[PDB]
Write an enzyme that holds these catalytic residues in place. Structure first.
Site, PDB file in Angstrom:
ATOM      1  N   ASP B  25       7.322   2.442 -29.066  1.00 33.86           N
ATOM      2  CA  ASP B  25       7.957   3.392 -28.161  1.00 33.86           C
ATOM      3  C   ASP B  25       7.021   4.039 -27.179  1.00 33.86           C
ATOM      4  OD1 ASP B  25       9.530   5.257 -26.966  1.00 33.86           O
ATOM      5  OD2 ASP B  25      10.229   6.188 -28.876  1.00 33.86           O
ATOM      6  N   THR B  26       6.998   3.468 -25.950  1.00 33.13           N
ATOM      7  CA  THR B  26       6.064   3.982 -24.952  1.00 33.13           C
ATOM      8  C   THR B  26       6.466   5.337 -24.428  1.00 33.13           C
ATOM      9  OG1 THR B  26       7.267   2.822 -23.181  1.00 33.13           O
ATOM     10  CG2 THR B  26       5.447   1.672 -24.226  1.00 33.13           C
ATOM     11  N   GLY B  27       7.678   5.786 -24.686  1.00 33.14           N
ATOM     12  CA  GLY B  27       8.167   7.093 -24.343  1.00 33.14           C
ATOM     13  C   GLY B  27       7.852   8.190 -25.322  1.00 33.14           C
TER      14      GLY B  27
HETATM   15  C1  G79 Z   1      21.054   5.173 -25.641  1.00 31.86           C
HETATM   16  O1  G79 Z   1      19.920   5.278 -24.814  1.00 31.86           O
HETATM   17  C2  G79 Z   1      19.055   6.253 -25.214  1.00 31.86           C
HETATM   18  C3  G79 Z   1      19.173   6.961 -26.413  1.00 31.86           C
HETATM   19  C4  G79 Z   1      18.169   7.853 -26.813  1.00 31.86           C
HETATM   20  C5  G79 Z   1      17.066   8.059 -26.017  1.00 31.86           C
HETATM   21  S1  G79 Z   1      15.707   9.053 -26.574  1.00 31.86           S
HETATM   22  O2  G79 Z   1      15.193   9.691 -25.353  1.00 31.86           O
HETATM   23  O3  G79 Z   1      16.233   9.920 -27.668  1.00 31.86           O
HETATM   24  N1  G79 Z   1      14.516   8.151 -27.258  1.00 31.86           N
HETATM   25  C6  G79 Z   1      14.940   7.325 -28.371  1.00 31.86           C
HETATM   26  C7  G79 Z   1      14.049   7.366 -29.604  1.00 31.86           C
HETATM   27  C8  G79 Z   1      13.852   8.766 -30.175  1.00 31.86           C
HETATM   28  C9  G79 Z   1      14.582   6.456 -30.713  1.00 31.86           C
HETATM   29  C10 G79 Z   1      13.463   7.587 -26.424  1.00 31.86           C
HETATM   30  C11 G79 Z   1      12.088   8.206 -26.720  1.00 31.86           C
HETATM   31  O4  G79 Z   1      11.062   7.427 -26.086  1.00 31.86           O
HETATM   32  C12 G79 Z   1      11.999   9.680 -26.309  1.00 31.86           C
HETATM   33  C13 G79 Z   1      11.966   9.875 -24.793  1.00 31.86           C
HETATM   34  C14 G79 Z   1      11.847  11.357 -24.434  1.00 31.86           C
HETATM   35  C15 G79 Z   1      10.693  11.862 -23.823  1.00 31.86           C
HETATM   36  C16 G79 Z   1      10.602  13.223 -23.531  1.00 31.86           C
HETATM   37  C17 G79 Z   1      11.679  14.066 -23.779  1.00 31.86           C
HETATM   38  C18 G79 Z   1      12.800  13.550 -24.391  1.00 31.86           C
HETATM   39  C19 G79 Z   1      12.900  12.211 -24.705  1.00 31.86           C
HETATM   40  N2  G79 Z   1      10.763  10.246 -26.848  1.00 31.86           N
HETATM   41  C20 G79 Z   1      10.809  11.298 -27.656  1.00 31.86           C
HETATM   42  O5  G79 Z   1      11.782  11.841 -28.178  1.00 31.86           O
HETATM   43  O6  G79 Z   1       9.528  11.815 -27.867  1.00 31.86           O
HETATM   44  C21 G79 Z   1       9.491  13.002 -28.639  1.00 31.86           C
HETATM   45  C22 G79 Z   1       9.086  12.693 -30.054  1.00 31.86           C
HETATM   46  C23 G79 Z   1       7.661  12.183 -30.106  1.00 31.86           C
HETATM   47  C24 G79 Z   1       6.706  13.229 -29.574  1.00 31.86           C
HETATM   48  C25 G79 Z   1       7.115  13.642 -28.200  1.00 31.86           C
HETATM   49  O7  G79 Z   1       6.826  12.686 -27.208  1.00 31.86           O
HETATM   50  C26 G79 Z   1       7.655  12.861 -26.073  1.00 31.86           C
HETATM   51  O8  G79 Z   1       6.904  13.341 -24.946  1.00 31.86           O
HETATM   52  C27 G79 Z   1       6.809  14.750 -25.138  1.00 31.86           C
HETATM   53  C28 G79 Z   1       8.099  15.173 -25.800  1.00 31.86           C
HETATM   54  C29 G79 Z   1       8.663  13.935 -26.445  1.00 31.86           C
HETATM   55  C30 G79 Z   1       8.558  14.009 -27.974  1.00 31.86           C
HETATM   56  C31 G79 Z   1      16.999   7.445 -24.774  1.00 31.86           C
HETATM   57  C32 G79 Z   1      17.943   6.479 -24.409  1.00 31.86           C
END
Ligand code: G79
Ligand code: CL
Ligand code: CL
Ligand code: NA
EC number: 3.4.23.16
Lengths: 99, 99
Positions: B25-27
């Site tokens: 998960d690059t996000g």
């Molecule tokens: C159906 O399609 C989608 C359904 C869900 C999502 S998601 O945004 O919930 N998510 C899915 C994951 C949790 C299975 C994508 C993630 O990449 C999400 C993307 C993301 C990024 C930032 C804010 C919200 C969401 N990252 C995330 O929640 O990161 C948080 C947990 C780890 C530590 C922190 O890193 C991140 O960077 C700092 C804060 C967050 C925090 C997107 C599209």
């Protein structure tokens, strides 16, 4: 390009005539943009992640430009904390994870 | 490997001698795993995702294998919907995004 992951992989996108910054997010099935207007029909959807679910508007057949590359697909619009380019559009620009 | 994104980028990890499935998960800044037992002391952390914030337990310097690659680093444990490998460990295994 090759983007390393020492920092958040943020790129400029163009959507709805607007420039925005967005995260290239391999953990996202779908693309989710902060509140904005888009043309055409939409339908409501709930998407879930860490911290639970949010309600979004689903717009189909939206053209985006991602780091210079054009794609078309579904875009979800709603109260996401950050703009996310998910797999539905990453695939269209030929993005891969490599190690 | 070169992983395309038409499907979720799910890999096998090994932590605590146990195999689990996780999403590359690059996000995600950080790696977050479902409830399990890990050794040592933990520290508190609040992380924010799409639906809001959750509390997790932060364990440092944990041995973890990801798709056959060895890493040693921070693992957050908490009520995540899916096991997520974030950039803190993606950098350790040499992952990049390419298009
Ligand atoms: C159906 O399609 C989608 C359904 C869900 C999502 S998601 O945004 O919930 N998510 C899915 C994951 C949790 C299975 C994508 C993630 O990449 C999400 C993307 C993301 C990024 C930032 C804010 C919200 C969401 N990252 C995330 O929640 O990161 C948080 C947990 C780890 C530590 C922190 O890193 C991140 O960077 C700092 C804060 C967050 C925090 C997107 C599209
Ligand atoms: Cl799509
Ligand atoms: Cl392909
Ligand atoms: Na449409």
């Amino acid at each position: 390009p090759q983007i390393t992951l020492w920092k958040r992989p943020l790129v400029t996108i163009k959507i709805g005539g607007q420039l925005k910054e967005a995260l290239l997010d391999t953990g996202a099935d779908d693309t989710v943009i902060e509140e904005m207007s888009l043309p055409g029909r939409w339908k409501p959807k709930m998407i879930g992640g860490i911290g639970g679910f949010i309600k979004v508007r689903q717009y189909d057949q939206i053209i985006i430009e991602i780091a210079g590359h054009k794609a078309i697909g579904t875009v979800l619009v709603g109260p996401t904390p950050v703009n996310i380019i998910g797999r539905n559009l990453l695939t269209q620009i030929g993005a891969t994870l490599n190690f």
